[PDB]
DNA sequence: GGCCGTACGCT
DNA sequence: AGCGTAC
DNA sequence: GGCCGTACGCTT
DNA sequence: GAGCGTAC
């Protein structure tokens, strides 16, 4: 469940999507309550490139985000109703945290594409190292990752839709073999 | 066979009742600790979890404490420890935690696999000298390990951090205090056995909550110190300030001890919602890790904000009493103690601790001296020593020959046989003669302490004053009137 | 610098994950047949002195050490893997010895780790044998604060022995358990014939051997599995028809297929009766007990053909199940689909390397020791001068130097002399050094002989394998029906 | 949390085990003779009825779970003939907390199912003494040491006096601390 | 202590 | 009323 | 990783 | 299918 900033003005308000309920708690105390909201994510989230609409719309996690963004999905997507102008992906500096990142991007791309084109979606950059988010001090999380004075965010940019459409389908797709080929082509071992 | 209902109830209940009482729910008057807390710290000790060394996973620490000393559910252990790390729970925190260890909002710590810990430097003072036979150890539950019955506790921790615990047939509720005031009270007492409470209250004003805030009046305090029981009115630190436009707000920056901030706020929100309190137009928590606790209550324009506040003390935990019940384990039995008794027992414990230390340091300095005398002899007659060994077929034979020829103890002779050849170079020989002389002086230093009751005592005083000077801090809680 | 391309981020991010799961989570190494979580548990059990002779330790302490030192993941994945290794209905050759509730065929859970204890199994020791004789390459742990092995010496063919299942990214792996006797014999046969056919190998190795036992139908599935690495093998329960009184009958089930939950299977049977999908069944009863063993009883209505009802439960329920063999393992840090012989070859070659490396480690070690013994020999013979030399000396350095000058001792030799305790100067002790030195010299030769002949090394591997077979070999549990 | 019943539906030969904790309950179910032994685990301390009110007691799940399981009903509605087991066996850890749980169960029975004790349907198991509790030992030894009739020693609960028994429960489990505290001060062997 | 989400491939 | 060790 | 059960006593 | 088994 969501922790919301006091400010009602979307332009200045940012929602961090945080990995784990440990990291979430630290982030809520650590964050600046005025402008910064927190939606924690309980582990791996549904891969929508493999799921049908019925299931997707029934997913708690997927449902909480839709609700929190308030922009609607698909044709009903109204970028004008976005309750936050910065949507931030905050995950561990491990391969699972990177997996989660790809699970989120697939969704945004497939349901809130205009949200990306508007450059609303960012990627946090926590300390690369041996510590997950749920092991860091809240004060430590704020300065490195969250304080706009010190943090280094990565705005997600979409160069090309066809290339993006093919890649998501290959990477997140139902057919294993093409994914197997991709790995085979690109693995350096 | 058969079992009578009346007798199984009487017996079953009592085994339980005595156990919660003497081994779970109540603190020891000497170190102020319950079984679970002591074993955790003793666990930080033996696992080498000192402040200089790095944090260690909380799961690993708790596992150790449960496998070795505390055969109870892991949640019980972890939350006790979590509480020790919380600067809003312990007046003088005992665990140094890394990760999420909770906040005033009543939010819990993260799970033990996500967090790490080690001692605080003041915990070091709790266990200082623990390995100098200063306290009696005991068999653990399965008989595999030895654990401390009590800690040295070189500061008066029962009162510093307080204790709250519900037993069977009884319960205890002891509030935290200012370390400096306590130690001064202790020192005053050591100079006057017949000191009254009143005079002790010259040093110790009252309770000092990690949460700061205000106490109302001295009478509850007074009664609690003289009997061990009394009511203490704790109030929040709240002020009234203009928000501009002729409108004011109430601002709260400190809350009563053991009060959930969040829950208190929902209590207020609820009263406004149900209209049981007039004059409030907004409620916000502005508490930030930077700007500290700050709860705001906007007052409707021209409303008397003082009156509102008054009712807020009447209707919410913005004011809360602390019921002091000072029952602590004394000589292994539950006793209700006044303040002076509390200090008397702590003092006797520091006497015994420093006495036992000084006696132990002695035994061991004489033990080592005896050895060095054995080695010096050898250095003196090294050629003969060699001859004697070389001409021995076996070590035992060499042991006997060495004892007989040079009039050595068995220990002295074992030592010699274990001596490495390099110990014969110039410097290595000087080191032995140098250790010995230093040691002879130490011994006679130690013997002086133990030869005079007052020397000993003053040593204890100095050792307190020192702790007081390093660790003693400012009073947090204001005692109004 | 604020900007990331969505295509490039997705390709990079997904590859890092996929790569990791593949080579460092979901797949077994062809050599010790372990996944990382499993390798670290056993290493930890070893690091902690948790041997069969040693008493059981609470599983929570074990997990914390495994977690904290080698495995930075959830303690649930950890403890659960460890629990599998301790279940005789999971592991054809269990590597963990558990005290407490470690769960059941029905598949309850183990008790939480604070309730249970464990230690190594005697067979596990054989995985760790010689690990400290520089037989395998160690590496840094994640926080770089420790060292863990990259693989175990694995003095038995464990990949095929216990098998593996794991869902990777882009691939999966399914490898069944086998009889260790038949397994080792297979290897022995390979070692004498680098050209042996799978068919020939199958003279030793008949097929899988599930801890749960039961039956297999036909050799064709197995043969395809072994020739190619993939194939469907048909797993039938052990059930018989028997009379119960009144001229009526029952089906009794006593071995179910591998990895089937007994309880879930029973529910399916119950469901079919309820839903009228099957006919002729009047009752269903699990009479399994610890003494009795697995007993599932199906009651058949009188004058109803049981053998027919039986066939229908094979068709309609997990009572008959398929094991889809898909033999993928890490070979050279890369996932490969291997066939039987490929499996056995990467193992054997491991062993040659492990035995060779152990032999070499021993050699350096023994030669080192001798050198020291020589230096000691000299000191005892010239002791009076040696002692004088040290007494004159004002430091270690001075003493060192002089001793090397006058006796042409090496720096390590002299060092050993300066560390010598006086008790070594007794008459008996001199004899003890001499005896030790002599054995060493013989030892050195022996070791040198093994290094000199690859055939001799190979026979050593053969001999060591065979002892394990004799000690741990047991009877084939699964019957194969044609 | 969920009762595991036996095969036999004939109460004369049926026994029900009230175990301590779900890890112990799981172990018990494998170890038991499922033909005649039904196990119900209790998850930790249970409601102290002597101190509670009726609406609460009836609503409480643990209390309800057992009434349903025994099949008698309670108070005036009690029917010892409706009993589904002739043996109700208390199986708690060999420790003080287990022994507390024991007094709590006995409080319930003597107060709501009193006829069940007088009938001698109530027994106390006796597992291995010592530091290990039920959830820490194997299912093969839980059976062989505590559940197996051939070797086990159960303790049939009897009551010779009912006035004395009423004062005890009231004194020990009642809501008057002081009579409890005095009893502890009189029998306290520190 | 239990219940429950998710990804991932294969059948 | 809810503090804090237990199951 | 977050829900949630119970016992225990209490401020003159 | 859905469930095998490591992960969040
Ligand atoms: C052993 C548990 C399994 N687990 C579960 C379990 C259940 C559910 N669920 O029911 O939604 C979600 C998650 C997701 C989960 C969680 O509960 N919280 C969380 O923050 N992250 C997770 O991955 C995970 C945790 C870390 O570990
Ligand atoms: C930290 C947990 C707390 N706990 C809980 C927790 C919740 C509930 N509940 O909601 O009914 C019952 C019990 C009772 C509890 C349990 O869940 N199961 C059990 O078997 N015994 C218990 O005491 C106990 C366990 C042992 O330890
Ligand atoms: Mn992580
Ligand atoms: Mn217990
Ligand atoms: Na089937």
Author numbering:
A (entry chain B): 417 to 545, 580 to 639
B (entry chain C): 10 to 490
C (entry chain A): 9 to 490
D (entry chain D): 416 to 545, 580 to 639
The publication says:
Bacteria have two well-conserved topo2As, DNA gyrase and topoisomerase IV (topo IV), which allow for dual targeting by antibacterials, affording reduced spontaneous resistance. Topo2As regulate DNA topology by creating a four base-pair-staggered double-stranded break (DSB) in one DNA duplex, passing another DNA duplex through this break and then resealing the break. As part of a structure-based approach to develop novel bacterial topo2A pharmacophores, we co-crystallized and determined structures of DNA-cleavage complexes of the S. aureus B27-A56(GKdel) fusion truncate (gyraseCORE) with QPT-1, etoposide and moxifloxacin.
With QPT-1, in addition to solving a 3.15-Å structure in this P21 cell, we also solved a 2.50-Å QPT-1 structure in a P61 cell with one complex in the asymmetric unit; the three QPT-1 complexes were similar but not identical (see bottom line of Table 1 (for nomenclature) and below). These complexes (ba_ba'2–QPT, BA_BA'2–QPT and BA_BA'2−QPT) come from the 2.5- and 3.15-Å QPT-1 co-crystal structures, which were obtained under the same crystallization conditions. Similar to the fluoroquinolones, QPT-1 is bound between the +1 and −1 bases at the DNA cleavage site inhibiting DNA re-ligation. QPT-1 interacts with residues in the TOPRIM domain of GyrB, with the barbituric acid moiety of QPT-1 packing under Arg458 and making a hydrogen bond to the main-chain N–H of Asp437, and quite a close interaction with the main-chain CH2 of Gly436. When the QPT-1-binding sites are compared, the largest difference is seen in the relative position of the G1 nucleotide, which is covalently attached to the catalytic tyrosine from the opposing subunit. The two S. aureus gyrase complexes with two etoposides bound (BA_BA'2–etop and BA_BA'2–etop) were both in the half-open Casym conformation.
